[PDB]
């Protein structure tokens, strides 16, 4: 329809939550491990167990990082979102 | 009180299930369900699909296990693709 769909507003929110955390320190277009930690702990507190051990954020960032630069860019964040969303869905069928 | 990010994830699931449930395999998007999803729910990000060939190409790109349809994991890859492209223009 002519209204922004729920899908399209979902997508916008993904962009917004990324930039809201990626913009905090260093490169404003990427999540270093500190930004990623805050994102997960503050915005995925219902889907993911809180992170407080540094080893965990290192491992998550390791699995997420495919450009090999030690940070999570938007494309890599989308892959992470895909993974998490898929997991919650698997317990919904 | 679920976050905006978490609400977005749930809406991704809800819209997949809305369209995948219409015809045939109720857990997968066939080509016609896929065309409708894009034309109905992505009209501000993607140009309307008017030709069969376009649906064919998209589904072909999306269908990585070869069954001719788009399951949820293949749908998420689609959403990642689109959202990432849009991310540039913002």
């Amino acid at each position: 329809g002519s209204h922004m769909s729920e899908l399209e507003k979902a997508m916008v929110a993904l962009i917004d939550v990324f930039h809201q955390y990626s913009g905090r320190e260093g490169d404003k277009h990427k999540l270093k491990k500190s930004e990623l930690k805050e994102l997960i702990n503050n915005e995925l507190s219902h889907f993911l167990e809180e992170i407080k051990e540094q080893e965990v954020v290192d491992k998550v960032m390791e699995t997420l990082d495919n450009d090999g630069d030690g940070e999570c860019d938007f494309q890599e964040f989308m892959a992470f979102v895909a993974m998490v969303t898929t997991a919650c869905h698997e317990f919904f069928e | 009180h679920m976050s905006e990010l978490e609400k977005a994830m749930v809406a991704l699931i809800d819209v997949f299930h809305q369209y995948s449930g219409r015809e045939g395999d109720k857990h997968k998007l066939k080509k016609s369900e896929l065309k409708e999803l894009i034309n109905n729910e992505l009209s501000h990000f993607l140009e309307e699909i008017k030709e069969q060939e376009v649906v064919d190409k998209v589904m072909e790109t999306l269908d990585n296990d070869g069954d001719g349809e788009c399951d949820f994991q293949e749908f998420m890859a689609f959403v990642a693709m689109v959202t990432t492209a849009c991310h540039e223009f913002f």
């Binding site: 889907f47 993911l48 167990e49 965990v56 491992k59 997991a87 | 990000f45 140009e47 790109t61």
Partner: peptide, 15 residues
């Protein structure tokens, strides 16, 4: 909400 722990074709113009 369980939860999941961790470790696991043309764009419009648009103004």
């Amino acid at each position: 909400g369980a939860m999941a722990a961790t470790y696991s074709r043309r764009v419009r113009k648009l103004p």
